């Protein structure tokens, strides 16, 4: 992706203050809560019929920690999310059959999670930068279509 020096900066400045232990399970939990059909990919996770059951689910938090792990890689190779997520792109696209639309969903729930935590600090320009990265990452995950 292409971010101005100001965006590239605000994004890493923001990320550095991200609780990587929680933020990922929260974005994943909100995705599953808010868009119930996504719960179908995680049946092994258990009863996801209530929001509190989804959010406190240890497997949801564990797995969520990996997802955040990926976005972190992205912010580390913004101009290479092509290869960085290349492997994942195959996982999600080739083996799983996740509709790219759902990648867009998750990415935007992440943005809302970030806004939920940084409040007013998540200014329009700052949100604008993340939509950029999030858009990049989702594109990379969809990238590999073999």
């Amino acid at each position: 992706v292409h971010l101005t020096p100001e965006e590239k900066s605000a994004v890493t400045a923001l990320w550095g203050k991200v609780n990587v232990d929680e933020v990922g399970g929260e974005a994943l939990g909100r995705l599953l809560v808010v868009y119930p059909w996504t719960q179908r990919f995680f049946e092994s996770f258990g009863d996801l019929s209530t929001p509190d059951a989804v959010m406190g689910n240890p497997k949801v938090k564990a797995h969520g920690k990996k997802v955040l792990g990926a976005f972190s890689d992205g912010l580390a190779h913004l101009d290479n999310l092509k290869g960085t997520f290349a492997t994942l792109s195959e996982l999600h696209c080739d083996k799983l059959h996740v509709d790219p639309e759902n990648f867009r969903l998750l990415g935007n729930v992440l943005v809302c999670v970030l806004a939920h935590h940084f409040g007013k600090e998540f200014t329009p320009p700052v949100q604008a930068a993340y939509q950029k990265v999030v858009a990049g990452v989702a594109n990379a995950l969809a990238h590999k279509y073999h």
Binding site: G29, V54, F122
Partner: protein
């Protein structure tokens, strides 16, 4: 349609936002204009500038239309028929754009009310905006 709990959550959020409705509406638009510049091509003769007064003014119109939606949750198709005509027939708004404004309404909400923006509320507000958005693009169907 919205459950009784969903209705209660949306109103709770509507009551809590209270006076800031028009402002949040202007912010969600500023947010949408910046994150999805493509959306700006729908407001050509507009000063999409920051402190813009035209934006401040459209934010209020949007929040009012939403408040009207809240008061006709079980009526919306009706209550919004005019708006549905404006946006679907005369304006030809790409339906994807409704997901983008709604997503921006939620960020605005979430950013000003971190603590109340719980997963359940998020869930309720999401269903609401999608009902609104679906009514507004209903003239394409």
């Amino acid at each position: 349609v919205l459950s009784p709990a969903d209705k209660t959550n949306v109103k709770a959020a509507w009551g809590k936002v209270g006076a800031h409705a028009g402002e949040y509406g202007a912010e969600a638009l500023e947010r949408m204009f910046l994150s999805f510049p493509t959306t700006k091509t729908y407001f050509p003769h507009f000063d999409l500038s920051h402190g813009s007064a035209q934006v401040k003014g459209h934010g209020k119109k949007v929040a009012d239309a939403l408040t009207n939606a809240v008061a006709h949750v079980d009526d919306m198709p009706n209550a919004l028929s005019a708006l549905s005509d404006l946006h679907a027939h005369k304006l030809r708004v790409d339906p994807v754009n409704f997901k983008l404004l709604s997503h921006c309404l939620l960020v605005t909400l979430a950013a000003h009310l971190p603590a109340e923006f719980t997963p359940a509320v998020h869930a309720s507000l999401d269903k609401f905006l999608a009902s609104v958005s679906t009514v507004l693009t209903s003239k394409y169907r």
